[PDB]
Design a protein around this ligand. Structure first.
Ligand SMILES: CCC[C@@H]1NC[C@@H](O)[C@H](O)[C@H]1C(=O)O
Ligand SMILES: CCC[C@@H]1NC[C@@H](O)[C@H](O)[C@H]1C(=O)O
Lengths: 600, 600
């Protein structure tokens, strides 16, 4: 993807613009573009908080289920001590589609809902005066979006969005908005890659695009003592005798790249961890040692902000995952806030990084009521779709490439691989991803009903990721049949592919408070029994190297007869209170040795 | 007390009269006695179920909180094949006060709310025709009732009942109503007492009042094979080599007493278990072996019947107590339905039998609002009161004397022994109880605030029963101070009295579903932590021989700022669903060896 690094603070800086309170108005009949609302202060507005989804801030179902365009707006005074500097305006996430006006000049456009976008806007502002930022946000999904969907227009012209993923289609500006200043010598991009041999010593090859001038680099210590130095726009190899990034700890050196121009200097510190991931046979190695993933599929979801990033929420949810014994998690169903990958970096949390490609499946929704008949087809998942997907992988890898916590990419989640053309679609995406980053493995999370004798595309990926729900959606309520089905299906996957197997979803809906002596579905007792049987089967299969229970907390979804106020598969309630199973896992995950598979 | 045995089925029988549907009407202005409503069919009635409390059958607060007289009524056809037989009409429990008319002849009167009452009514009916039963039920409590209370009349003359016990003052006909026929030779009463030496052999002395004729007895086997025979109105000793009644099993011989008159025979089978209870030093022996009580303080309380006896409820609640590992319980705060003591008899459940003497304490209610200033005084707990109490002990012992499950009598629960005259009151009651039955020990359950340096009456009883709530009502939320206070108070009791100590109440209010990471009051996590600390302290004190957590299920109480829909101290919800702590106890109570104290 296009060059981009996280704005970090050096002797050149940034001014936060998530002042929260912006002017918001929905655009019910698309009068916005016609009257180019970007030209004058928004007519009939109400205060909105940024970052946060717009759906639940007003406790009104008619905004919540709204489909179309919405408008955010805010004036800003640009500090004047920035004259003779390049001013860039970065949105870290505007969910689905966004385009923005610096009063009357349009600067940016973007269709990715969970990855940042910026543009050099130094020629459209001059320091000292205040300019109006106007943003147009679209929350519509068609077949060429990631994720896909179908907007449908009723007799009256009202839009209603249909999609094929579980979680609710929150929208708005979900993450940081930000003006930042950099010297006129550009450090546009950095790439770092790490190698190790027997933990004693090795090196970090390096590449850098620095648009405007000479580059020297110094890798410094936690003590910020210089441990090696390089020179050059690329190469930039140095060798060490380091303390290398390990799951329990997360030791981070600091790559200080300097960009000397003939008059201007530019300094960027990029945190690096010396880790080497690979897979060998049925083992997922990290610094040449097998690893056992424990933890969760998560979500960006809280009670009144939707998917809006929040620092308290990050701190408290890491406190819970740490207590519970989790050592890993995967950014379930879209790229997460980079704050979380920095956190995982500093604390040694291992992360499976996933794109927003969910809902490439029309076999999962179940009920009594027009979806296309060919998944892979011109009307549905098409060629435009494949390039949109490849673009989504491009942005995610472009943004999380140097993070030590990122240990694996996941292209998509639960696609249907039964129809022909599934492999036609996914093969070039797997190959392209492999060339965009050869450092980490490639996975594609596998859906329950593309079983081992049925799935078409798992050949193309390095590590097998399974979402299994025997005993819940099938064999409902019967632990003795679910155990057999699960164990032969696991052994089957192993015989078929001899890969490491990570169970990336396994869970059951559990109403907090619903208790039962009969250990039936929806009780806390059932959650415990079910997870516990699954754990015996994992412990009895050689190739399973990971367990991430399906959902850390309950989250919101679309309305339906299967979702009681949302998906209740969480170990914790949406307000982070523990169900009984929370103590089951805490007993397992801190009982085992760190990163080691329980020996049965 | 007056002679009475359970109606059991021989070649002379009984016809059940809990036909449920009776005519019920409340008597709002005491017009009942004046118009002697007993004379004609009840004016303006509604159907009521018998047995069951009248409070919650109609989902109406104005009947629920009603104080005064209520009227039940029902016609009955007396079977004619009963001519020349004695017909007796027995109410097994009419709660608080009851008096009854066989159409126009009044036959019975009773003030005990949980013990049966009958009367020979052979001269007031003749077999073949149908007579109307009319019952007047009073639910008022004054200072000479067991339990006591204060009715208070507002400006308008409406009664409202005030009391000083936790549970709600349910009323009505709570248990079996019953017409039964016996031959004109009376077996009015039987008493059986058991002795053992070294489990090899001994005897059961015996006494019998059989009003009308010669008596022979045969003690028969579970096989009903004759193992010994006696002759005489008393003495009736025989010696055995028996399999003796043990907690885990409950072996019951059958004492078949026959009453030969010159023309009529009468046969009564009375189930007996060969058990010997006593206390020695700090040990509670049963068949000369120390015992550890586990289990609950219970209640007669369910969701729509109030305190009405129900067979399903008995079967299901015994299934839960059996699963959970309980081996004992105590009939908390009133005599229970004899069905439950028969059950405990057959299954080997050990029972601490208690009278209805609760609320002899004006220091327990807490709030912001006229109770007497002297507990023991002429206006309050008086001499009439003491004779009423002695009468209550008389009836309970008279009815549960031959039950092997009954292992101890408890005169009262949580009286205040601080004021002078507490010992003046309770001493003659303790001595009288000891002469009414020397077979089993005597206890008086001790309230939290009459601590070891304060209590006045514990000298007078055999086994010390403690209700302790450190960490809940005092030291609220602090497990580390509650542990110290509890441990020194337990050791203090032991130094002071060198008796066996049974913790007969210990528990915390727990909202099912309320979970917390901070282990604070009202969460399930707090229930578990609290009970668990209490268990460490029990395990570290020599003299503690028993643990009965406070309440098996949540139950209803009077309204107040301290009771959220009732007392929430149950391990189970009112509809019998388990809280998290239910599995804590199940792990302890079935982990230990049966009847043995955990060795720490
Ligand atoms: C069989 C499909 C299961 C499905 N897997 C994807 C998750 O995004 C959903 O939350 C989960 C669920 O339905 O609970
Ligand atoms: C400190 C008195 C505690 C009291 N003990 C008697 C029981 O009948 C109550 O239910 C119990 C409670 O308050 O929970």
């Amino acid at each position: 993807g296009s060059h981009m690094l996280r704005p970090v603070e050096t002797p050149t800086r940034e001014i936060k613009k998530l002042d929260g309170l912006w002017a918001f108005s929905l655009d019910r009949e698309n009068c916005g573009i016609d009257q180019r609302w970007w030209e004058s202060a928004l007519q009939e507005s109400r205060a909105i908080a940024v970052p946060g989804s717009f759906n639940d801030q007003f406790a009104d179902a008619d905004i919540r289920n709204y489909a179309g365009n919405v408008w955010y707006q805010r004036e800003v005074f640009i500090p004047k001590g920035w004259a003779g500097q390049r001013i860039v305006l970065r949105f870290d996430a505007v969910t689905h589609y966004g385009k923005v006006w610096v009063n009357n000049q349009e600067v940016m456009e973007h269709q990715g809902g969970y990855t940042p976008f910026e543009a050099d806007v130094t020629p459209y502002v001059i320091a000292g005066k205040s300019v109006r930022i106007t943003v147009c946000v679209n929350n519509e999904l068609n077949w060429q979006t990631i994720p896909p969907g179908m907007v449908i227009t009723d007799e009256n012209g009202k839009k209603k969005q249909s999609y094929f993923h579980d979680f609710f289609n929150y929208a708005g500006i979900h993450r940081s908005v930000m003006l930042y200043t950099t010297p006129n010598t550009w450090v546009d991009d950095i790439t770092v890659v790490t190698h190790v041999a027997q933990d004693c010593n090795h090196a970090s090859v390096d590449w850098q695009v620095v648009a405007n001038g000479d580059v020297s680099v110094e890798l410094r210590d936690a003590d910020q003592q210089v441990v090696a130095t390089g020179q050059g726009t690329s190469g930039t190899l140095q060798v060490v005798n380091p303390h290398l990034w390990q799951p329990g700890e997360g030791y981070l050196y600091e790559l200080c790249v300097t960009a000397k121009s003939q008059t201007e200097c530019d300094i960027y510190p990029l945190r690096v961890g010396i880790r080497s991931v690979a897979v060998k046979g049925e083992q997922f190695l990290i610094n040449h040692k097998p690893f056992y993933f424990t933890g969760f599929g998560r979500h960006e979801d809280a009670d009144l902000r939707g998917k809006g990033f929040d620092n308290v929420l990050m701190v408290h949810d890491h406190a819970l995952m740490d207590w519970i014994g989790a050592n890993s998690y995967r950014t379930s169903h879209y790229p997460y806030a980079e704050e979380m990958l920095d956190w995982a970096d500093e604390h040694g949390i291992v992360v499976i990084d996933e794109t927003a490609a969910v809902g490439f499946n029309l076999s999962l929704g179940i009920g009594f009521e027009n979806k296309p008949k060919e998944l892979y087809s011109e009307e549905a998942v098409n060629g435009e779709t494949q390039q949109a997907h490849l673009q989504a992988i491009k942005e995610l890898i472009a943004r999380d490439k140097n993070h030590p916590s990122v240990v694996m990419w996941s292209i998509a989640n639960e696609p249907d691989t039964r129809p022909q053309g599934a492999r036609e679609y996914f093969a070039p995406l797997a190959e392209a991803t492999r060339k965009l980053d050869p450092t980490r493995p490639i996975t594609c999370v596998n859906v329950m009903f593309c079983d081992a004798h049925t799935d078409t595309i798992s050949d193309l990926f390095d590590v097998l990721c399974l979402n299994r729900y025997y005993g819940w959606y099938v064999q409902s309520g019967d632990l003795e049949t679910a155990e057999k089905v699960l164990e032969k299906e696991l052994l089957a996957w192993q015989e078929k592919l001899h890969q490491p197997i990570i169970i990336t979803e396994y869970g059951v809906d559990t109403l907090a408070g619903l208790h039962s002596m009969y250990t039936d579905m929806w009780s806390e007792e059932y959650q415990c029994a079910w997870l516990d049987m699954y754990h015996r089967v994992f412990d009895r299969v050689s190739a399973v190297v990971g367990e991430q229970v399906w959902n850390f907390a309950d989250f919101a979804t679309s309305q339906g007869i299967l979702r009681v106020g949302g998906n209740k598969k969480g170990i914790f309630t949406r307000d982070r209170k523990p169900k009984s199973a929370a103590f089951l896992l805490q007993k397992r995950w801190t009982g085992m040795n760190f990163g080691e598979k329980p020996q049965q």
